[PDB]
A paper describes a structure:
Prenyltransferases, also known as isoprenyl diphosphate synthases, catalyze the sequential condensation of a basic five-carbon building block (C5), the isopentenyl diphosphate (IPP), to synthesize prenyl precursors of isoprenoid metabolites and isoprene polymers, collectively called polyisoprene. Ultrahigh molecular weight cis-1,4-polyisoprene and trans-1,4-polyisoprene (TPI), which are the principal components of natural rubber and gutta-percha, respectively, are also isoprenoid metabolites that are assumed to be synthesized by specialized prenyltransferases. These prenyltransferases are divided into two major groups, the cis-1,4-prenyltransferases (CPTs) and trans-1,4-prenyltransferases (TPTs), based on the stereochemistry of the double bond formed during IPP condensation. To investigate the molecular properties of the EuTPT proteins, we determined the three-dimensional structures of EuTPT3 and EuFPS1 using X-ray crystallography. Similar to EuFPS1 and other prenyltransferases, the EuTPT3 subunits were composed of 10 core helices (α1-α10) with a deep pocket that included two DDxxD motifs responsible for substrates binding.
The crystal structure of apo EuTPT3 was determined from two crystal forms with space groups P43212 and C2, refined at 3.0 and 3.3 Å resolution, respectively. All dimers observed in the two crystal forms were superimposable with a root-mean-square deviation (RMSD) range of 0.797–0.941 Å over 595–633 aligned Cα atoms. The superimposition parameters suggested that the dimeric architecture of EuTPS3 was highly conserved and unlikely to be caused by crystal packing. In EuTPT3, α6 of one subunit interacted with α5 and α6 of the neighboring subunit to form a four-helix bundle, whereas, in EuFPS1, α4 of one subunit was inserted between α5 and α6 of the neighboring subunit to form a six-helix bundle of α4–α6 at the dimer interface. Thus, EuTPT3 had a larger central tunnel than EuFPS1. The tunnel is mainly composed by hydrophobic residues of α5 and α6, which is considered the path for the products because the chain length determination element locates in this region. Among the structural elements involved in substrate binding and catalytic activity, EuTPT3 featured two conserved DDxxD motifs at the active site, both of which could contribute to substrate recognition. EuTPT3 also featured structurally conserved basic residues (Lys46, Arg50, Arg109, and Lys348) in the equivalent positions. Crystal structure of EuTPT3 showed that the residues Ile164-Ala165 contact with Ile164 and Ile125 of the neighboring subunit in the hydrophobic tunnel, suggesting that smaller side chains such as valine and glycine provide the wider path for the product that may contribute to the activity difference.
Author numbering:
A (entry chain B): 1 to 102, 113 to 348
B (entry chain A): 3 to 65, 73 to 348
């Protein structure tokens, strides 16, 4: 089960050798190994669905719009899309650098190591894009698109940092607006906007002519994160392949915030005294408070209403290839159990 | 005088950014963006941005169009935008206090989100400024590289500083010298000292990859500049500085606090835990008195004399006499300064 995905995976190794044995940025033999270890720990491995969606999207935009000379994707076409797909995976790798880190005094030294790891990787994307796109017309537009998503990611990463730290001293810091900003800037941009926007820039398109699609993808990114959060609570761990830890891990879950908005005083103090522990006695009291607040129903309500909104906004787009791409994104997420 | 010729450049750029066809904005959003813009970028001495133009002027002399000054000033004002973004988060602990100056925490992420999003707005101006005014030059890509380097180095430092300032409220042992050095270097040294000279240099038609030694000097000189800052906030003629030192009350990660924790023993360590990040002058004085007892006034004289001599030596070892002149100018205006 790999096909063009196997053809995609190889590109990481090509970019990695380029980045390491680059004359413009020399490296000690010890520097190279140190950088390569950071690269391999952080960037390859995983589902790769974000980077691949760049290639899958570029393939669907070409298949439908065309007006190019042939509809089959060139080997050089597949490769360049994969280079952007892997740039996406680098952006992603940087965004997650901090997600462990979690007593307190050991935290800034620990955090310092992680920050420098991402510093190394962040300085890779400009070089990747320059090596492989410096000559195209759209190069400057591509640098913009990446600068925007890169900068929005860093903002979301900083808020998630402030927020996950402030959550250890007071759960009331987790709020609905803050959750939406973290989800939007830290995740939605690279996850849903960035792939397709990459396919469009190399397809020879201007992004300022797709603001209606950019709002759709960003909202679809929020919807996707509300899904993950919900699944981490209850969703057949044998289907997901993972045990839910968000309630234990003291995460800023869509569930937790919707809880503290609807539940009051007595229910609120129940949550402070039971959220984020490791024995199931408190984990179940939480899961029961969510059931008491009907949060499975509030979620399923949110799901159908948001799906209707986006399908409407999608059916209302002028670009049939774009909407065909967004329709595949939305149906691949809808009511997914995994 | 040339300062007045430099300041209007801000208004030039501010007018460009707002009434950009490529970036439409409501009249009501434009006021909001302008309020963010001028609250954060102009005002203050503007010395970093000015050092770009003075540096270009000294480099050119030792090897002048009005438009030249404009472009140099455009880069100097670019520096001020970077400086602005680095500092957006610095009073995040005192603006979350919607009380007096008491613990908060729940109101902290809302406060931070505002700040983060302000700096996000200002961070998107530098690429537009550099493109508008340099898209066409030989060195344009060298400029985009240079600003991406410092921009990213700045971003790392504030992220570490954030982690550090938060973890410093709970458990004081979080403040350490390696963490202090990293923050000082990545958050500050890059934009303040490297970036100005590097701007004057790349526009002067130079490649930065052949100035690694000058860069190492400038970054270290930036760290030296911050250790001076920290030391003065404790004892440095509060009447001369024109400001009252607030660092001990504010529970800041000072070079001094770090050096104290290194030298002091468990009794002195507890004196520091039980005082320090408090308000009353009685507890603040126990610290400033503990600093004296640990000999941190002389330890500072050692760092300064050694860093000054060490850098003077490294600078004189540069082949480029024009570069040596600029770094010597920076070093001698920082040296033993009382304000």
């Amino acid at each position: 089960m790999t096909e063009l995905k196997s053809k995609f995976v190889k590109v990481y190794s090509v970019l990695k050798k380029e980045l390491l044995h680059d004359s413009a940025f020399g490296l000690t033999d010890d520097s190279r190994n140190w950088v390569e270890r950071i690269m391999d720990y952080n960037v390859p491995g995983g589902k790769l669905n974000r980077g691949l969606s760049v290639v899958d999207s570029y393939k669907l935009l070409r298949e439908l719009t065309n007006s190019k000379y042939k509809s089959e994707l060139s080997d050089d076409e597949i490769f360049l899309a994969s280079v952007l797909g892997w740039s996406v995976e680098w952006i992603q790798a940087c965004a997650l650098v901090l997600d462990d880190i979690m007593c307190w005094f050991r935290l800034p030294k620990v955090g310092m190591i992680a920050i420098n790891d991402g510093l190394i990787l962040r300085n890779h994307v400009p070089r990747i894009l320059r090596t492989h796109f410096q000559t195209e017309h759209y190069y400057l537009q591509l640098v913009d698109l990446f600068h925007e998503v890169e900068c929005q990611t860093i903002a979301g990463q900083m808020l998630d940092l402030i927020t996950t730290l402030a959550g250890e001293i007071n759960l009331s810091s987790y709020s609905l607006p803050v959750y939406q900003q973290i989800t939007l800037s830290k995740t939605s941009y690279y996850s849903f906007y960035l792939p397709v926007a990459c396919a469009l820039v190399m397809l020879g398109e201007n992004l300022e002519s797709h603001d209606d699609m950019k709002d759709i993808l960003l909202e679809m990114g929020t919807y996707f994160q509300v899904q993950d959060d919900y699944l981490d609570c209850f969703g057949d761990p044998e289907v997901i392949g993972k045990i839910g830890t968000d309630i234990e891990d003291n995460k800023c879950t869509w569930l937790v915030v919707q809880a503290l908005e609807h539940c009051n005083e007595e229910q609120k103090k129940l949550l402070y005294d039971n959220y984020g522990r490791k024995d199931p006695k408190q984990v179940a009291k939480v899961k029961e408070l969510y059931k008491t607040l009907n949060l499975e129903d509030l979620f399923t309500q949110y799901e159908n209403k948001t799906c209707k909104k986006l399908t409407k906004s999608i059916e209302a787009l002028p670009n049939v290839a774009v909407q065909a791409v967004l329709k595949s994104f939305l149906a691949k997420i809808h009511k997914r159990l995994k």
